[PDB]
Amino acid sequence: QPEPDMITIFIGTWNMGNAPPPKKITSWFLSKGQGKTRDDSADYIPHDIYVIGTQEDPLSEKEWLEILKHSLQEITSVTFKTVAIHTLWNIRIVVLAKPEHENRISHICTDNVKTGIANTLGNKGAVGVSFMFNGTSLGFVNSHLTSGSEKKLRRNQNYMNILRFLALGDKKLSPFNITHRFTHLFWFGDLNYRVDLPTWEAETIIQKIKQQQYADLLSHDQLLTERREQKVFLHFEEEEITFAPTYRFERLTRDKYAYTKQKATGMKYNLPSWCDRVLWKSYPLVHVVCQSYGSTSDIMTSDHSPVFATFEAGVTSQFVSKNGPGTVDSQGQIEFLRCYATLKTKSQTKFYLEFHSSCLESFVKSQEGENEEGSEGELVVKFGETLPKLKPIISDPEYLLDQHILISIKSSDSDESYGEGCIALRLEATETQLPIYTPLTHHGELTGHFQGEIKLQTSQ
């Protein structure tokens, strides 16, 4: 049986509004309704992995697993295996996979983060799952962020606390947060960002939704505007939105948005908004293609509509050679030339690099760089040709060109990372000096850049 080089992944997010679901929810898993929908000719074709995030979920794990598995069996005639399930309060993630993938999936990891302090600790946060699919690491985060149109900054803070504190993926990647630990990271949920228009415009917004004039409303979506200002979700991608706002509906119809302030809303307006979102971040030069992104029209138990997204995701095989794993392959090497980091820090310490990759037997520390002042105030840390030569475990270019090197720049004084990035080895040429580049982040915020040249030797 050949190992796959692509899988398809279903992501769902649904804030259930503390109500049980209706008897049929298959339109969700079939990507049918509004937006970018899946072709009818694919309806019997199972996705490889289904990741279901709920918020305000009233069901037990058992109750929801029975609904999910029976739903997928009806659609596909496949009995899916449960990879993982994790619940924090009423926030839940379920991962299901086709039975043929059971012996491809390993290193399963679950975690949660509770957001807020005192008043604001008690029901928001995130759950996540990670695992390996053969040679590819996959991460999934379902977050329910702070509600309310005037709390976008709180949502951004919630996001930072989640990516700092969620402990998924390889713990040996100690300098790296979840935004660097996975070949593919999917982050979805009731992110709760709103269409920021005046309350008086509520009926105008509804008009525009009825006319399917979404681009105009999207120019005021707080998640797009905060992302464009680099306040949140830096270096993530979202498909274009072509479906109506998924919140806030009257229950048992989709004909009516319930936006007016009520005691039950804390006297807050809920103008129609795209609360419910799917974003992703994949390592450079890996295949990832969004093939659906939309909302259902026929599931009406909640004041939110479910959202679906589906993806093609490149995956790699487990690789065994006569040499690595268990030793190095002397026919392989990775050389960094003429490298320098540009940092935004005002601190004066020396810095060194750490190189992490599953193509190395263990992480590699460089010598300290040479600090200089940039012509616009910046710290520049020069490594020249001083960086260690990296010795991969496997030299076969069918393996090595698919790998990635994570880089941390660390203070000699504290050994704390000031910035993290990622370099793909999917080069235009081997045995050739080629430019490389990554932005550097810390806690998901831009802290600098790393650039230089690489020279990759493979066995070919």
Ligand X SMILES: c1ccc(CN[C@H]2CCNC2)cc1
Ligand Y SMILES: c1ccc(CN[C@@H]2CCNC2)cc1
Q: Which of 171, 228, 263, 322 binds ligand Y (CB under 6 A)?
A: 228
Q: Which of 92, 98, 208, 227 binds ligand Y (CB under 6 A)?
A: 227
Residue 281 Cβ, how far from ligand X at the closest point, in Å?
Answer: 24
Decide: helix, strand or coil at residue 158: helix
**Residue 103's binding partner, choosing from ligand X, ligand Y, none, with beta-carbon cut-off 5 to 8 A by kind?**
ligand X
- Nearest-CA neighbor of 46 among 9, 5, 3? 9
297 Cβ contact list (under 8 Å, min separation 6): 27, 33, 34, 254, 305
Between CA 251 and CA 28 the distance in angstroms is 17
**Residue 79's binding partner, choosing from ligand Y, ligand X, none, with beta-carbon cut-off 5 to 8 A by kind?**
none
DSSP string, 57-84: --S-HHHHHHHHHHHHHHHHS---EEEE
| Contact region with ligand Y (CB under 6 A), list: 75-83, 208-216, 224-232, 308-316 | 224-232
Residue 226 Cβ, how far from ligand Y at the closest point, in Å?
Answer: 9
Between CA 121 and CA 416 the distance in angstroms is 28
CB nearer to ligand X: pick between 101 and 391: 101
Q: Are the C-beta atoms of residues 393 and 359 closer than 8 Å to each other?
A: yes
| Contact region with ligand X (CB under 6 A), list: 96-104, 116-124, 223-231, 276-284 | 96-104
Between CA 305 and CA 298 the distance in angstroms is 9
Residue 83 Cβ, how far from ligand X at the closest point, in Å?
Answer: 4
- Nearest-CA neighbor of 284 among 37, 134, 416, 454? 454
Is residue 224 near ligand Y by the rule CB under 6 A? yes
Between CA 4 and CA 27 the distance in angstroms is 27
**Residue 63's binding partner, choosing from ligand X, ligand Y, none, with beta-carbon cut-off 5 to 8 A by kind?**
none
CB nearer to ligand X: pick between 105 and 409: 105
Nearest residue (beta carbon) to ligand X? 105
CB nearer to ligand X: pick between 102 and 372: 102
CB nearer to ligand Y: pick between 11 and 241: 241
Is residue 106 near ligand X by the rule CB under 6 A? yes
Between CA 16 and CA 32 the distance in angstroms is 18
From residue 66 to residue 85, the character string flagging contacts with ligand X as x (rule: CB under 6 A) and all else as - is: ---------------x-x--
Between CA 43 and CA 37 the distance in angstroms is 11
Q: How many residues bind ligand X (CB under 6 A)?
A: 7
3-state percent helix, strand, coil for the chain, nearest multiple of 5: 20, 35, 45
Residue 424 Cβ, how far from ligand X at the closest point, in Å?
Answer: 27
Give the footprint of ligand Y on this chain (CB under 6 A).
224, 227-228
Binding site for ligand X (CB under 6 A): 81, 83, 97, 102-103, 105-106
